[PDB]
Subunit: 125 residues, 2 copies
């Protein structure tokens, strides 16, 4: 179960992520905007979601809130994709209920290690 | 097979570039700074060089001048790696003698297409 929903509107980044994931044994799914991401919340369910802070059509925080409203999605791990610089500064220490984050640009190895760490994580408390 | 010298001090970008190129059957060679790049100018020589504008130890422009002064390296294609914002703005229209440029971030498909087009031309 290695289906990864890649919710990232920056095409070069989204495609890079898909490539890294493919080569490391995962099944990446592109979501280039908010509605595209919502339309992937069904069988077969994502095992983990990578999520940018802002998309055409909706924000990352809006998407997380959407996920939490339903039993079938509320336990899917979410890892934020954070742009180095201005965005990173604005969102540091922001509690969203997301499980982890990673800053762009990242190395292929760091992305994979962060995803694997989140996937093996025990359910809190 | 074909040797690509990746001269880039931004580690995540350098590692991404090498990852894409290696899975696509190229032989990427990493250079994280200026001296590392100069140290890779020996047999077997690179088939193409991807080059950042500024490195620890020396600039992209400096490295191009180094390449052009030697008969063995003068015809190796050079593609600049350009960052958005401040850098892209200053290097707009700089006639460096590089064969092409690519703006970061780029997709895997764009990277490979650009290098293959430069090598064919
Ligand atoms: Na975004
Ligand atoms: Na640089």
């Amino acid at each position: 179960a290695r289906r990864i929903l890649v919710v990232e509107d920056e095409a070069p980044i989204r495609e890079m992520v898909c490539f890294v994931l493919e080569q490391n044994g995962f099944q990446p799914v592109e979501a280039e905007d908010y509605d595209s991401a919502v339309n992937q919340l069904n069988e077969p369910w994502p095992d983990l979601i990578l999520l940018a802070w802002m998309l055409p059509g909706g924000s990352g925080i809006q998407f997380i809130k959407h996920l939490r409203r339903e039993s079938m999605t509320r336990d899917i791990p979410v890892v934020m994709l954070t742009a180095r610089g201005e965005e990173e500064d604005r969102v540091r220490g922001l509690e969203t209920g997301a499980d982890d984050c990673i800053t762009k640009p990242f190395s292929p190895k760091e992305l994979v290690a962060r995803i694997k760490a989140v996937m093996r994580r025990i359910s809190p408390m």
